[PDB]
Amino acid sequence: SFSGYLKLTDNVYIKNADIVEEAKKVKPTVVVNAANVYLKHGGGVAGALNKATNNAMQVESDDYIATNGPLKVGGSCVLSGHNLAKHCLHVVGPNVNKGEDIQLLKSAYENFNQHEVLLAPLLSAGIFGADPIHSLRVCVDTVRTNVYLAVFDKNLYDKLVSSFL
Ligand SMILES: Nc1nc2ccc([C@@H]3CCC[C@H]3C(=O)O)cc2s1
């Protein structure tokens, strides 16, 4: 069960934790991956989640692309969670450093509403270049189901809690 979270709003909770370790302890119904449109999990949260499955997530993802084609920015797909969760919801936030529209961050977070409870990272807040505090605001304004956010970096976590509480 989710332990040590701080409740920010009626439905958004936050913890300073590594999402891979949270997934292995809780084994939630849904873990969110911060993915790209071809589901190539090369680094960031995507690389860490794929490595914790010993590349099983990548083999499954390449088969999903071969049959279905790439996702759209703001879109998602549900695949196995392997040893981390029952399911992995792979969500594509905009890569604003490559000119993708920040408005698509709202569409990205809307995918979370299809699941009652999710363990997730902040979208577009890694190498995708969005300001992480702006990404948390979009999450709060868009997600209506129960989301447990895991923020690895303690300096970032303290910044987020100071601005949202
Ligand atoms: N093993 C892990 N590797 C990563 C890499 C990056 C991150 C996320 C991506 C966006 C914000 C950052 C964070 O929470 O500090 C979390 C994790 S957990």
PDB file of C-alpha atoms in Angstrom, residues 37-115:
ATOM      1  CA  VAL A  37       5.680   8.122 -29.481  1.00  0.00           C
ATOM      2  CA  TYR A  38       7.733   5.072 -30.531  1.00  0.00           C
ATOM      3  CA  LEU A  39       7.919   3.656 -26.984  1.00  0.00           C
ATOM      4  CA  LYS A  40      11.730   3.618 -27.084  1.00  0.00           C
ATOM      5  CA  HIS A  41      12.606   3.626 -23.356  1.00  0.00           C
ATOM      6  CA  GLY A  42      16.174   4.974 -23.622  1.00  0.00           C
ATOM      7  CA  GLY A  43      16.531   7.164 -20.534  1.00  0.00           C
ATOM      8  CA  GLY A  44      14.792   9.121 -17.807  1.00  0.00           C
ATOM      9  CA  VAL A  45      11.855   7.411 -16.055  1.00  0.00           C
ATOM     10  CA  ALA A  46      11.207   5.275 -19.186  1.00  0.00           C
ATOM     11  CA  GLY A  47      14.740   3.827 -19.136  1.00  0.00           C
ATOM     12  CA  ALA A  48      14.532   3.127 -15.374  1.00  0.00           C
ATOM     13  CA  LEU A  49      11.155   1.360 -15.573  1.00  0.00           C
ATOM     14  CA  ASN A  50      12.290  -0.706 -18.605  1.00  0.00           C
ATOM     15  CA  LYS A  51      15.573  -1.690 -16.851  1.00  0.00           C
ATOM     16  CA  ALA A  52      13.599  -2.858 -13.763  1.00  0.00           C
ATOM     17  CA  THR A  53      11.680  -5.267 -16.101  1.00  0.00           C
ATOM     18  CA  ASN A  54      15.071  -6.462 -17.547  1.00  0.00           C
ATOM     19  CA  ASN A  55      14.044  -5.215 -21.032  1.00  0.00           C
ATOM     20  CA  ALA A  56      10.691  -7.122 -21.071  1.00  0.00           C
ATOM     21  CA  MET A  57       8.839  -3.767 -21.377  1.00  0.00           C
ATOM     22  CA  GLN A  58      10.932  -2.803 -24.448  1.00  0.00           C
ATOM     23  CA  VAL A  59      10.331  -6.149 -26.279  1.00  0.00           C
ATOM     24  CA  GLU A  60       6.588  -5.860 -25.613  1.00  0.00           C
ATOM     25  CA  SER A  61       6.626  -2.152 -26.686  1.00  0.00           C
ATOM     26  CA  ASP A  62       8.376  -2.921 -30.018  1.00  0.00           C
ATOM     27  CA  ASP A  63       5.631  -5.505 -30.761  1.00  0.00           C
ATOM     28  CA  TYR A  64       2.925  -2.944 -29.884  1.00  0.00           C
ATOM     29  CA  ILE A  65       4.497  -0.457 -32.382  1.00  0.00           C
ATOM     30  CA  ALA A  66       4.887  -3.091 -35.086  1.00  0.00           C
ATOM     31  CA  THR A  67       1.158  -3.919 -34.901  1.00  0.00           C
ATOM     32  CA  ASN A  68      -0.349  -0.489 -34.063  1.00  0.00           C
ATOM     33  CA  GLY A  69       2.000   2.233 -35.197  1.00  0.00           C
ATOM     34  CA  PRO A  70       3.322   5.070 -32.997  1.00  0.00           C
ATOM     35  CA  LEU A  71       1.272   6.964 -30.417  1.00  0.00           C
ATOM     36  CA  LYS A  72       0.333  10.657 -30.961  1.00  0.00           C
ATOM     37  CA  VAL A  73       1.749  13.360 -28.594  1.00  0.00           C
ATOM     38  CA  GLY A  74      -0.858  13.685 -25.791  1.00  0.00           C
ATOM     39  CA  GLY A  75      -1.841  10.007 -26.315  1.00  0.00           C
ATOM     40  CA  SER A  76      -1.402   6.710 -24.484  1.00  0.00           C
ATOM     41  CA  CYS A  77      -1.633   2.960 -24.524  1.00  0.00           C
ATOM     42  CA  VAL A  78      -2.081   0.291 -21.821  1.00  0.00           C
ATOM     43  CA  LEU A  79       0.487  -2.556 -21.787  1.00  0.00           C
ATOM     44  CA  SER A  80       1.651  -5.092 -19.122  1.00  0.00           C
ATOM     45  CA  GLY A  81       3.185  -3.772 -15.938  1.00  0.00           C
ATOM     46  CA  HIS A  82       5.335  -6.930 -15.722  1.00  0.00           C
ATOM     47  CA  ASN A  83       6.870  -7.159 -12.174  1.00  0.00           C
ATOM     48  CA  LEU A  84       6.137  -3.454 -11.421  1.00  0.00           C
ATOM     49  CA  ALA A  85       2.323  -3.249 -11.685  1.00  0.00           C
ATOM     50  CA  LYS A  86      -0.724  -5.048 -13.164  1.00  0.00           C
ATOM     51  CA  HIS A  87      -0.593  -2.527 -16.089  1.00  0.00           C
ATOM     52  CA  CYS A  88       1.720   0.188 -17.465  1.00  0.00           C
ATOM     53  CA  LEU A  89      -0.047   3.258 -18.897  1.00  0.00           C
ATOM     54  CA  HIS A  90       2.506   4.691 -21.398  1.00  0.00           C
ATOM     55  CA  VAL A  91       1.743   8.418 -21.821  1.00  0.00           C
ATOM     56  CA  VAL A  92       3.339  10.867 -24.223  1.00  0.00           C
ATOM     57  CA  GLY A  93       3.745  14.438 -22.970  1.00  0.00           C
ATOM     58  CA  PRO A  94       5.004  17.136 -25.334  1.00  0.00           C
ATOM     59  CA  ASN A  95       8.715  17.581 -25.805  1.00  0.00           C
ATOM     60  CA  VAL A  96       8.594  21.369 -25.596  1.00  0.00           C
ATOM     61  CA  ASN A  97      12.366  21.587 -26.309  1.00  0.00           C
ATOM     62  CA  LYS A  98      11.530  20.298 -29.844  1.00  0.00           C
ATOM     63  CA  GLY A  99       8.653  22.798 -30.320  1.00  0.00           C
ATOM     64  CA  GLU A 100       5.798  20.459 -29.331  1.00  0.00           C
ATOM     65  CA  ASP A 101       2.896  22.487 -27.935  1.00  0.00           C
ATOM     66  CA  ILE A 102       2.682  22.786 -24.141  1.00  0.00           C
ATOM     67  CA  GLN A 103      -1.147  22.655 -24.503  1.00  0.00           C
ATOM     68  CA  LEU A 104      -0.725  18.931 -25.188  1.00  0.00           C
ATOM     69  CA  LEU A 105       0.389  18.471 -21.549  1.00  0.00           C
ATOM     70  CA  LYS A 106      -3.347  18.796 -20.603  1.00  0.00           C
ATOM     71  CA  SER A 107      -4.249  16.022 -23.184  1.00  0.00           C
ATOM     72  CA  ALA A 108      -1.439  13.876 -21.768  1.00  0.00           C
ATOM     73  CA  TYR A 109      -2.746  14.103 -18.181  1.00  0.00           C
ATOM     74  CA  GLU A 110      -6.357  13.470 -19.379  1.00  0.00           C
ATOM     75  CA  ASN A 111      -5.283   9.845 -20.073  1.00  0.00           C
ATOM     76  CA  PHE A 112      -4.924   9.307 -16.303  1.00  0.00           C
ATOM     77  CA  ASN A 113      -8.716   9.758 -15.879  1.00  0.00           C
ATOM     78  CA  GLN A 114      -9.380   6.347 -17.431  1.00  0.00           C
ATOM     79  CA  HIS A 115      -7.870   4.723 -14.247  1.00  0.00           C
TER      80      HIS A 115
END
